[PDB]
Nucleic acid binder design. Structure first.
Ligand code: MG
Lengths: 217, 158, 173
RNA sequence: AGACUAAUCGAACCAUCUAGUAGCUGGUUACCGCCGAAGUUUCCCUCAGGAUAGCAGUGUCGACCUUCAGUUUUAUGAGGUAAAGCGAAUGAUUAGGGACUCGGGGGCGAUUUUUAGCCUUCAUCCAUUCUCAAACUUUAAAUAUGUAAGAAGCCCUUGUUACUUAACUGAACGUGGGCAUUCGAAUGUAUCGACACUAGUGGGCCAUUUUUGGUAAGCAGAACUGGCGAUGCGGGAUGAACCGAACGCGGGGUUAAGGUGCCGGAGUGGACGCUCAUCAGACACCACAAAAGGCGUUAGUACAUCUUGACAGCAGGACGGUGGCCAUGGAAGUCGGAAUCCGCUAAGGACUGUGUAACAACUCACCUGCCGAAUGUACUAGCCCUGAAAAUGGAUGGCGCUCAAGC
RNA sequence: AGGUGUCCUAAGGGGGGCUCAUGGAGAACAGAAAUCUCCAGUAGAACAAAAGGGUAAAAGUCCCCUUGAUUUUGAUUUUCA
RNA sequence: CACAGGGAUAACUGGCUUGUGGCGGCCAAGCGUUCAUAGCGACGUCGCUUUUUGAUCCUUCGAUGUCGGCUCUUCCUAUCAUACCGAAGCAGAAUUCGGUAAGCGUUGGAUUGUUCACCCACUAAUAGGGAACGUGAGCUGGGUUUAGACCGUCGUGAGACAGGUUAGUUUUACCCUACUGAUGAACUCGUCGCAAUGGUAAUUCAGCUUAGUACGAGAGGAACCGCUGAUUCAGAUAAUUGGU
């Protein structure tokens, strides 16, 4: 018997995370955050698409998890279980309260009304801002249409307004396509499991030349 | 709701970061005389002879000197009137103030400018004055030619 | 409003570590030479780290049209704000002076997109040199060979205080 | 039966004490002139009340002292909020990679396994990675805040002491002298200092910004400031709090907020456009409407195609290995699983639907015949439309308005 | 979110020597944990109690001596008239 | 039981809010033999109404008569039946989903003070609501809610119980307005007429024939036209029958 999501939409209180002060909060509904080939190298999936927010509101953990399922279903069917990597980039840490009335409006003992109305935990919710990213997907270059439809269908489970933007970077890295391409050719790039590391020319020679042998020729 | 002698002094009376332990000994070598302008700044590591949290940041006039403490006069603002408070503070919490130092420096030059000018025979123009508006001048464009600007189009960065 | 084109010249105040700073020139449409300077500072604050309290104004002059009795086609590149984002635009006009094009553009944008004067940036204005580089159809129709057209059903003008006419008017003028 | 005791009984009637007391309701009598508030601090068997401080009036006195200031400039101190941070401490938290086996578990090589064997699943270290903190922080604003800007000042010599120093060495208070020619930033001074006696008030409410409890409220509780109360006037049709502006009796001139088709004083004023609604729309606080859709119309972004002849339209074809491999009552392209090749070309898919128990038959993709020029697709936001259901007859103020008297 | 109507002849005062929690590597029974040794170790331990501040040749810790927890009245600070 | 006061303070209407209550949408994993949308809809999300119940205490305490039933008028549509239509996993018949539509109807009884409910029976159908939770100078007084009295539990006792039971006074209209009707001064007295405006009215079913037909393997089984009657409502009349 959860309250309608219209009732918790505007950020009206200071952040209220779980700590040694409020104890006994229910576990957030969503737990998984990565799906697909979450161990693919950076050179396999060079296309990245994001779903960006456009208002300053609250998104509930229940809503986030439901949206996650929708995108996963569509991508698996039309692109294959081994052709994408999806990541959710919004974690719910804000606790919203509730004041029970009728159940707390009993004849025996206690007080009925608005006397002493500090509430009890009732669930968790995520705070988003303008321009914040919610869901990211990386895949090949021939899955443009597939990725776009998945997010467009995903958004119907969130309240508010969101946009879909095709990024200009390479994968999940903060580098533009041309710059990353030419820098890797220069050789100041070392592959890691599902990500990369870069050269910094401030360590000591012996360790740097082992890690990046191709930078010196 | 309580009101103790050190209520709400969590960050004021604390020492800084990477400033702990020994007190620099140059503090104990200064000297004070009545009429000096000092300002109060409490040190958390010394619990004897320390002032209430209100005077942390105020400035006053010494009026008494003792074995290891000085008496300072400061003006408190109660509703609709001022009162003069007389507090005893240990010298570990005080410091000489540079509030009047500019005035003393300026008065010395004023005296000597006036003396020198009287011997020579030209008026003084000694008292200061605020910043007046600028004056006319010329700017050449030789070897510096202007560059044309324009607003930039919109594009997404992420 | 009633606009005019100004060239505005500004500079950073010279200092001991940097005498003779650089000079920046811009072309600004504005009703008078007070809002001209304000627009200059507003556009400069978004490109380079210069205030007005730490800068100075070198010159301000008026640019007049070179041939205000010749008809010519214009193209304008601009950016503006909607209620839910920002966008780029390109429109074309046909008249005799650059200043009027900015006059016409402002009215057209305010009418068709509800875009006030607050939120519009003028990237570039250029008069189309040849005739074959015209793109929009609502002007291609106006440069056809041997143009001519009648004017049917044009009401005659009657004094707004001559009430009670005595015969039926006619619209065949 | 708490019944009856002269129309009176859960304690008769008559006179006196007695004009019994009330922090509680009700009333409180002619005119003009000048000044003009509070619902707040502390205490009370205090919470519908008092004392205390504050706000206010009157009477003056000291000079006309020339001092002052809800302000700015210049010089110099204090702070831990907004923001920011976690490849920085504390706390929360998602994911791979490298190093390791004797840390735990499940296997394999003779489960031999006390084989530092081959696997691996946790756990542990190392370099990285996605998100957070009112009671976390290395950093760190804006607005506000303390002090100073001299004649009661600055410099020179030397008298007093029962204090202090080894000591006329110091510290305070002094005598004498020198430094103004200009007393040492701006602006104002339509209001300087001190004292005496006392009235009312001690239920408050509203608004921009900051903000706490609550689903929310014409709800409850706070900070700086401005208002109503205690206040009329012009505008919002009407309305204590909104906009303009504060008031002796009159004459002339000009405006503010707001308006100029009529009611209604003043434009059926001028320029460029958008909208046709069988529920149009019509001015801040304000008297309401959303998610989602439209080949209604207008403006824009991007990409693809094309006289080697496109999109649309009409007409022709739409073959073989081969009923490919499995699957099973039977499945020959079309229940399902997994594969996804070539020949001939102008062209044809180990297939897009209809269809059979299975075939057959029909059709689509693709190419071709006719024509004579520019199209096709996906997105963005303006007005309009659908979404849009309540009770006496009815309200953009009314009549009415359509290249508007609408935006 | 929590706390008080107590406790202490030392848990007050003075002086003096030492450095902690924990990790690494070793030593008969001894092992995960008993006692001993070396190295590293910015406080991650301790300071009667709730939370915050403060402390390293100490304000902790061990050792030696004591009763400034004494007599006479005044001035000043926070809550505040 | 009493007094001085309070709408600074509760129990009922009215006002703001809509959590809970009721009603309606948007996306589409799936159900539906195959097939998301004939008929439905999880995980999520957007709204509407003031016939439920809450929260607040703005208006009334020198008083606005506080449950239910009886009689009567009118209004709303979120449509039970009646008119005409669009869809189906609509052969016929019986049905289910939707549109224009509030003109016309929506019952008789056993038990309970009941509002609420549950059974019997007829019918085309036995839809949901408002008007100061319509309606007490319109009625009644079964219940709650003064004083008498009995029981059970609690209290030492006086007494308490949103626990059960029995008996308990229901006042005034002639004023103003509103409504139903009836007169009426001014331009001489009369007869015969026109019609601005206001009101408005009809409703449903059954039998025969079409027909044992269309449809269907069978079992079953319609409709328009035509004819004759009947239920509810409205306006008159008294020769016959009955009442007085
Ligand atoms: Mg038959």
């Amino acid at each position: 018997a959860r309250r309608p999501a219209r009732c918790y939409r505007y950020c009206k209180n200071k952040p209220y995370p779980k700590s040694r002060f409020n104890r006994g909060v229910p576990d957030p509904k969503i737990k998984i955050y990565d799906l697909g080939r979450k161990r693919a190298t950076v050179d396999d999936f060079p296309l990245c698409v994001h779903l960006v927010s456009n208002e300053y509101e609250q998104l509930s953990s229940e809503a986030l998890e439901a949206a996650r399922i929708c995108a996963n279903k569509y991508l698996v069917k039309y692109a294959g279980k081994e052709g994408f990597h999806l990541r959710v980039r919004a974690h719910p840490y804000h606790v919203i309260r509730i004041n029970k009335m009728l159940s707390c409006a009993g004849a025996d003992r206690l007080q009925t009304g608005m006397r002493g109305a500090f509430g009890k935990p009732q669930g968790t919710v995520a705070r988003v801002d303008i321009g914040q990213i919610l869901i990211s997907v990386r895949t090949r270059d021939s899955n443009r249409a597939i990725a776009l439809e998945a997010l467009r269908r995903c958004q119907y489970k969130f309240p508010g307004r969101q946009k879909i933007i095709v990024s200009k970077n390479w994968g999940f890295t903060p580098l533009r396509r041309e710059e990353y391409l030419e820098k890797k050719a220069a050789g100041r790039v070392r592959v890691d499991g599902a990500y990369v590391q870069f050269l910094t020319n401030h360590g000591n020679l012996e360790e740097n030349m082992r890690r990046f042998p191709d930078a010196f020729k | 709701h309580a009101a103790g002698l050190r209520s709400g002094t969590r960050y004021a009376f604390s020492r800084g970061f990477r400033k702990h332990g020994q007190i620099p000994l140059s503090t104990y070598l200064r000297t004070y005389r009545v009429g000096d302008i000092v300002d109060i700044k409490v040190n958390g590591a010394v619990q004897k002879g320390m002032p209430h949290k209100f005077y942390h940041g105020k400035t006053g006039v010494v009026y008494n000197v003792t074995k290891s403490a000085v008496g300072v006069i400061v003006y408190k603002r109660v509703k609709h009137r001022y009162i003069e408070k007389r507090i005893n503070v240990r010298i570990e919490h005080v410091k000489p103030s540079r509030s009047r130092e500019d005035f003393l420096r300026r008065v010395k030059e004023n005296a000597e400018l006036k003396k020198k000018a009287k011997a020579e025979g030209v008026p003084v123009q000694l008292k200061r004055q605020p910043a007046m508006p600028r004056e006319a001048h010329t700017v050449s464009i030789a070897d510096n030619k202007p560059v044309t600007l324009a607003p930039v189009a919109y594009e997404t960065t992420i | 409003g009633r606009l005019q084109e100004y060239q505005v010249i500004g500079r950073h105040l010279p200092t001991e570590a940097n005498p003779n700073p650089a000079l920046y020139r811009m072309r600004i449409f504005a009703p008078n030479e007070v809002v001209a300077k304000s627009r200059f500072w507003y556009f400069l604050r978004g490109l380079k780290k210069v205030k007005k309290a730490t800068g100075e104004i070198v010159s301000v002059n008026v640019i007049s049209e070179k041939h205000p009795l010749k008809v010519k086609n214009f193209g304008i590149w601009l950016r503006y704000d909607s209620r839910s984002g920002t966008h780029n635009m390109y429109k074309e006009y046909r008249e005799t002076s650059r200043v009027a094009a900015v006059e016409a553009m402002y009215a057209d944008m305010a009418a068709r997109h509800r875009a006030r004067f607050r939120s519009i940036h003028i990237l570039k204005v250029v008069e189309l040199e040849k005739t074959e580089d015209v793109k929009r159809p609502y002007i291609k129709q106006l440069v056809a060979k041997n143009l001519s057209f009648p004017l049917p059903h044009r009401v005659p003008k009657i004094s707004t205080k001559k009430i009670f006419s005595a015969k039926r008017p006619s619209t065949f003028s």
